[PDB]
Amino acid sequence: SVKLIESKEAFQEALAAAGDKLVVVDFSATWCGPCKMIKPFFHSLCDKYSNVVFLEVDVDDCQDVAADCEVKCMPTFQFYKKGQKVGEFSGANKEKLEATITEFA
Structure with a gap:
């Protein structure tokens, strides 16, 4: 249910197509420990918020x-609303992730 972004063009199509929904972007790598840590949580959020768009960018790919x-640093989470970056932080911080969704969902 998380959309895996595999090019710049794809990234840009996803932002346009979100309309005015919050977009949460996880910049991640398969080998990176904090990325492995948060990934289950990130998927589960994807289920919890059907009004919010969840994208993942593999930085190696x-x-x-x-x-x-x-x-x-990975993971990095960026937050977009109307093509604007309204937020950003790095680390597998579940409180901050959910705080930012709460602010802009």
């Missing part, structure tokens, strides 16, 4: 988008 989005 999607290096261009990682660069464009100024990622340096």
Whole structure:
């Protein structure tokens, strides 16, 4: 139910198509421990909020988008609403993730 983004073009189509729904983006890597830690939680949120769009960007596979989005630590979560980045943080922080969704869902 999380949409896996595999190019820049795909990233941009997903943002447009969200309308004015919150978009939560997990910039992740399969090898990275905090990424493994939070992934079940992130999927479960996807189920909990049907009004919110959940995307995942594999930084190893999607290096261009990682660069464009100024990622340096994983996981990084970015939050978009009307194409605008309304929030961002890094770390497997469940409180912050849910705090930010609460703020803009």
